[PDB]
Amino acid sequence: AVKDALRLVHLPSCSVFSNWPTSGTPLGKVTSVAFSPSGGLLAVGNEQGKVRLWKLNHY
């Protein structure tokens, strides 16, 4: 519905992450989300047709 409306929730604590996403993170109207089976990559599609890729260094 709105831009930058993406949050990552840690489990089993259920506490939303604070450092990311920020005001400067480009997400747009998030319409698709995908986690890689391995390697900890996060792909986020948006209404503009851009698939932006992030890596979780923990994995």
Partner: protein, 350 residues
């Protein structure tokens, strides 16, 4: 720009080993260059891959072990961890791992039979023996502040002198453990340091369109070969008979008799690949044996494709044309042009 981080033909020029990234992990795969085997069995894609289980781990050096020399085909992999992996392509498992005491990444490796020489980022030489699987000796030569490249001169059946390079090039004697000679190198770090023949080794540097041919004994620049664009790979034929250099812009240049105005020579034949629609397909590696030249390019994302051509008969400027998918109407074998089932009978219409 190129998904293939590193590539290397085998000495015979029939098998190419390339390293690429899958997600965040590097995978090492071997593919067959020839379209068909000697027996005539049609060549097929090899799905097997060696996956590096750690994201940090990376391959810095790739070197083939000559197929004829050893019973088992194997490829030696230098790793940023500070250890060298001996990889057997058939078993698809790392047979043995040579580890240096330190953790610095291996910059370059070279092999002559049982001899195996490597250099770390700390500029410390090491010697290994494949049959013994032992670290023989390690030493540091003064005035070798950086060492990006190592090549062992092919003298007899033993190693008596090593060619090593930085922005400048040097010759070192193993027994004396001291530099024998120095050559004025490039401004940028040296990228290729192959030895064309005796008393003649070529040298090229990153982001440079010039190749310097030096005399090992005398030390004067015999020639300077000039490419249209920057140089990435280099392959020499016979004994200085021909030299093929893969440019950065995706074109392949062939130097015909570069050892015979005289100071600076330009490439004689230029080869390109362009799809039928019009898109240009870059060339990332090549091989040239006697009169046949093998060109390698990437289709899809990382699938390598190969073609064999006889460069002698090719004109000076030659563009290979390849059918790549573009706006293909998709024809299913069980449908005609109009989408009617083939088995179905045509109806009667007045």
């Amino acid at each position: 720009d190129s998904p293939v981080l590193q590539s290397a033909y085998d000495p015979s020029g029939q098998y190419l080993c390339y390293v690429t990234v899958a997600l965040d992990k590097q995978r090492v795969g071997v593919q067959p260059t020839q379209r068909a085997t000697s027996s005539g069995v049609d060549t097929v894609w090899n799905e097997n891959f060696l996956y590096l289980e750690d994201s940090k781990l990376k391959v810095t050096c790739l070197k083939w072990v000559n197929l004829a020399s050893s019973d088992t085909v194997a490829i030696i992999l230098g790793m940023n961890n500070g250890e060298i992996w001996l990889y057997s392509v058939l078993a698809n498992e790392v047979t043995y791992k040579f580890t240096t005491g330190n953790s610095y990444e291996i910059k370059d490796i070279d092999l002559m039979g049982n001899q195996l020489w490597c250099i770390d980022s700390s500029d410390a030489f090491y010697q290994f023996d494949l049959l013994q699987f032992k670290l023989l000796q390690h030493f540091r030569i003064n005035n070798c502040v950086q060492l990006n490249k190592l090549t062992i001169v092919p003298a007899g059946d033993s190693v008596a002198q090593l060619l090593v390079a930085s922005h400048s090039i040097s010759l070192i004697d193993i027994e004396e453990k001291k530099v024998v000679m120095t050559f004025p190198g490039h401004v940028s770090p040296v990228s290729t340091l192959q030895v064309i023949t005796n008393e003649f080794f070529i040298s090229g540097a990153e982001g440079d369109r010039f190749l310097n041919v030096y005399d090992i004994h005398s030390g004067m620049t015999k020639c300077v070969l000039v490419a249209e664009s920057d140089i990435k790979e280099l392959s020499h034929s016979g004994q200085a008979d021909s030299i093929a250099v893969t440019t950065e812009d995706g074109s392949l240049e062939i130097f015909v008799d570069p050892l015979v105005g005289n100071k600076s020579k330009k490439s004689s034949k230029k080869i390109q690949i362009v799809s039928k629609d019009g898109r240009k397909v870059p060339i990332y590696n090549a091989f040239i044996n006697k009169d046949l030249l093998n060109v390698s390019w990437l289709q899809n994302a990382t699938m390598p494709y190969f073609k064999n051509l006889q460069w002698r008969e090719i004109p000076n400027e030659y563009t290979v044309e390849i059918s790549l998918n573009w706006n293909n109407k998709n024809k299913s074998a069980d449908r005609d042009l109009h989408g009617k089932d083939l088995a179905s009978a045509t109806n009667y219409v007045e």
